[PDB]
Amino acid sequence: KSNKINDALNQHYKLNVELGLVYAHYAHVADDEFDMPYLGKFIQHLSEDKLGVHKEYISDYFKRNGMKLKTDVSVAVKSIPSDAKALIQEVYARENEVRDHVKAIAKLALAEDDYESFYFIQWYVRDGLKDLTEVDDVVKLFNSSNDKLIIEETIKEMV
Amino acid sequence: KSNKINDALNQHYKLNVELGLVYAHYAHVADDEFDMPYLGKFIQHLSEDKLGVHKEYISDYFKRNGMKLKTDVSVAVKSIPSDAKALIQEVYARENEVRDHVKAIAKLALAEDDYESFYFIQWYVRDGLKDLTEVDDVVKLFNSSNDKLIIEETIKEMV
Amino acid sequence: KSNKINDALNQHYKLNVELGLVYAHYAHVADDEFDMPYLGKFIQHLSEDKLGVHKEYISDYFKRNGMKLKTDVSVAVKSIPSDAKALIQEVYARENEVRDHVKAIAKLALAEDDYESFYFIQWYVRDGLKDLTEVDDVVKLFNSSNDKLIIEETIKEMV
Amino acid sequence: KSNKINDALNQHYKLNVELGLVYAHYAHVADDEFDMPYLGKFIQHLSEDKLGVHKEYISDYFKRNGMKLKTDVSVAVKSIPSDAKALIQEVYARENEVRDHVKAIAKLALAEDDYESFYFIQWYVRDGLKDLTEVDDVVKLFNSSNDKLIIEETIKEMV
Amino acid sequence: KSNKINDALNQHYKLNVELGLVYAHYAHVADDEFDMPYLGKFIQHLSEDKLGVHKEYISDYFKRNGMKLKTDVSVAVKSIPSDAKALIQEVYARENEVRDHVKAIAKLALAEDDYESFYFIQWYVRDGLKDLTEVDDVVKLFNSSNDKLIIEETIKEMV
Amino acid sequence: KSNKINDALNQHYKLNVELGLVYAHYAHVADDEFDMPYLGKFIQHLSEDKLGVHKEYISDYFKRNGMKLKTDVSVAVKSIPSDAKALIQEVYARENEVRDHVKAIAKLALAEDDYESFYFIQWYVRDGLKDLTEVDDVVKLFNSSNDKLIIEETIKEMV
Amino acid sequence: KSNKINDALNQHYKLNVELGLVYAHYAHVADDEFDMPYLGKFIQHLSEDKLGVHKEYISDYFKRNGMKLKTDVSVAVKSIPSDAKALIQEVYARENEVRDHVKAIAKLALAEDDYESFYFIQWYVRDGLKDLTEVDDVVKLFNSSNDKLIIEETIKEMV
């Protein structure tokens, strides 16, 4: 097993956990402070996504190839974006950074001739683009209407 | 809303998140290092429990009564118990401490005449005893047999 | 049986009856004067709630523990809020006062060592918070959009 | 719209509310003090009848023809009939007075050439006679047997 | 675990066992000596209630919190009430005393900050009032009719 | 009716009640102290057997033939066997004594030419042998394996 | 088509055939000599896997891209591992070597810009890790218990 891939995947595990905890806070704020419970449910589903399969796939993959899991988590939510559009724009920015880290891991697996890892990362390559697409669709709405309740209703059909 | 109850519930939110992240690591170790995948699935279900409804009930309760959510999370898993029995014994110890914190919150709600909070905490009072009972049943097995595969098979029927 | 609990529960019976009659008027006004029939149906359901189980639970509880029922009802609706948002804001204020009276009854039952009464009041402790949450969700909409028909459509899915 | 019909219908709304609150008390007393829970359920159904459709039909009719609703309610139950037969005899007397008020409203609608109102009142003309028939059937039983449990059993099949 | 709560719950276990054995005798006598087999089945169901879940909940609760079970039972039925009404009146008296013991245990749990115990006792707080209500409904019948077969038939529908 | 049969059956009623209360304690101890919850459920089913039909058949038989029921119960569980095998061995000993008392009642019924009683006792003659067979099958396991969890699993299929 | 990829895939075809024939022998020995028929069925399923789709996918892929199939097979099973744990440990070693050959083919396809081949090999990259995981799970059991029949029973649920 590759130590650099092991480290890179342990950092991605850490990123998904910390992002998931931030999104859970953002989801609470979207509902409570911004009166957009469907925006909150959208962000909450992203939170459970990062804290669910996004982190468990890595821990399960480690079991198979003899890599070691590291749990080292530090996250504090110290400021909140000022309104709902800024809130989901901040979610978009974090999701775009996820794509960059995933790209680095794919590049490294090919450099290490670690084709089991390149394969494993394929899911994340795809899911990074679709999570970002789902978020971008929501960011769209805030530039498409000035009525929070119209946006809310549109979110309800986007699940 | 009570500031002391708000602080006490924010600390319990923090405890459930951090416990959930530790259990996820313990579940990985139970399977990978100790060859007890059903012990791992038992601990993993506890992890999803703490990181799921145990934390979301608090955030949802805050939305209703005007309390504020705090996300301040710090956890590192720096040593692992040496074998499976010590692993689940350590889970038992953490679950027993949960009962003590839950008791303090119930006592405080009555002191504050905060009966909505005393009510909310009732679930946790009960779930604290049953989570501890489920864990204690697993600790039982390691003193009841010296065969890991017998214990494993018994865990598989305890879900 | 406690005379003070009996008096406190008889006043709560009186409050639920009088609130129910006011809400029935408010529901009529929401539909007829303000053109918001779904706001009216929301308020009408609150009216039937107070005039239904909220009052009958008390009368039934009295049958069990030997307390006496008092019927002494006086209510006149002499002014109406000027628009729909003020109408539902006034409903919110009344529902928040209900929480305070419920809290006093819980405190008194513990003071009297009347644990059957503390138990009975638990439903009301919970229902006070959820009725207030349902009303607060509707008050949200009037600060989320300036289009009565958008608010109306959003109410129709909130039942 | 007719002001006299509006006033006459507002008084009938007031009568149905106040009668409904009295019957709810009578139903409680029939069960608790007189040991006739089925007599109580009979009277309770009359209570929900007056406090339900009997009052809501008027408020809904007002929405259609531009009449105004008045909520002005004053009722105290200060004495209770001494036994069950007197209790249901008192219910009969109140129901018979309802017929007289309904008759006055029908007479007035014809005098005003208000045929929408004469039509609306037709339901009440009929329901006044059948409510009084249902009550009279129960009053029958107390002159037909001296055994409360026989009367109770007969009430249970009369719904 | 609290020693005083342990003792108080062990005495309640003892009370439910001894009451259950007395009711089983009373049920036999209601059928055989008093010709009221449905009164007997009513009392027999109370007997199985006390000797069933009323005692097993305590023993199961002890397993969870580390309290010890005591079995110390002494009961002799040395006199029987003279007729059926006195028989069920005596059942009522015993059930009313159960409420008082349950109240003492709830008061003690709050005094000990034993919120798991206060929670456990909630069932008994409620069941004490409803068992007493069921018995009181049967005592009602003996003051409502002088015909044992009418009372019997009424009991058959009260289960 | 025979006075000696009446006395012999009243003593058997007393034996089944007292045995049932002891088994309920033994079942609690098998689960809590010995970590054998399925052994506990086996013993608990024996407890409900003695406290159920084993005692009610006698009380019902008395109703038919004019014998009198006596309730005189005295039982204290003052020592517990030291381990699970001794626990079920003690259950076996008590069940074997039941066979001897049942035999004495059958012998007495034939001596009294009480053929209704000899018939009634036939069930007990049979059930005495099968209850003892069920218990003996469990005692078998403790001499067949030294692993409590293997024994536990075998008990789970023996119901 | 690449001659080096053609040669590398023809060697992998040869490896899967020869491994499949060895596993078929090992499966026979696991059942017959070692009394572990479920271990035998596990190894037999691996045998049919290598001799089935693992070899036919290659021959079918050759049909599509114009590569030539070579059949050149030489295998003799001349010694058998001494016990069951050594038997499955030897299976593990062979499966781990399969991963190395699969890795070389993936590396070569990228070197040849043969992306149809890199794609085809992806299945094998994944199946190499899961076949090795399935085998490793069985090797686990021999270090988890010293009872062949416990291991056998555990294998039966692992299919």
Ligand SMILES: [Cl-]
């Ligand atoms: Cl941070």
Ligand SMILES: [Cl-]
């Ligand atoms: Cl690889």
Ligand SMILES: [Cl-]
């Ligand atoms: Cl830490």
Ligand SMILES: [Cl-]
């Ligand atoms: Cl409160």
Ligand SMILES: [Cl-]
């Ligand atoms: Cl007023």
Ligand SMILES: [Cl-]
């Ligand atoms: Cl109480």
Ligand SMILES: [Cl-]
């Ligand atoms: Cl009045």
Ligand SMILES: [Cl-]
């Ligand atoms: Cl007209």
Ligand SMILES: [Cl-]
């Ligand atoms: Cl006694």
Ligand SMILES: [Cl-]
């Ligand atoms: Cl507690």
Ligand SMILES: [Cl-]
């Ligand atoms: Cl004794």
Ligand SMILES: [Cl-]
């Ligand atoms: Cl005979």
Ligand SMILES: [Cl-]
């Ligand atoms: Cl060879």
Ligand SMILES: [Cl-]
């Ligand atoms: Cl290509």
Ligand SMILES: [Fe+3]
């Ligand atoms: Fe919400």
Ligand SMILES: [Fe+3]
């Ligand atoms: Fe996903």
